[PDB]
Amino acid sequence: KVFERCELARTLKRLGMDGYRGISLANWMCLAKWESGYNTRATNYNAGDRSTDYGIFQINSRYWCNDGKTPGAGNACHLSCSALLQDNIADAVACAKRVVRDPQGIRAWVAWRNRCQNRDVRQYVQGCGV
């Protein structure tokens, strides 16, 4: 599923993301925007290290989910990476919450540092009723 901006903003709010560990909804929106263009089926295989980024938040198989083909791989979210390719984003949101509980928080995503950190991200939730 390729979410429309505001639809996703409300979907995320209903899932308890607004202010989760101090992260505003607009930051989560900016993250999904740049990671996958709000596309739940997005996948990026990294040939250099054998890992794969899955779903709307492009969560990596090395530490976060199990796909059966990534070495030493943790499955910190205790999910099949398959769960991160569903139209329903509840599992992906549960896993993104798990990621941010780590020291780095949302900084774990390089694309958020590159395109959301220290930026005006208000536009992502404007007019969405969130």
Q: Just list the catalytic residues.
A: 35, 53
Is 25 within 8 Å of 129 (Cβ atoms)?
Answer: no
Is 106 within 8 Å of 23 (Cβ atoms)?
Answer: yes
- What CA–CA distance (Å, rounded) separates 123 from 115? 13
Instruction: Write the Ramachandran bin of 24: left for phi over 0, alpha for psi from -120 to 50, otherwise beta.
Output: beta
- In the chain, breaks (C-N over 2.5 A) are found after none
Q: Residue 20: what are its φ and ψ, rounded to 5°? A: -65, 120
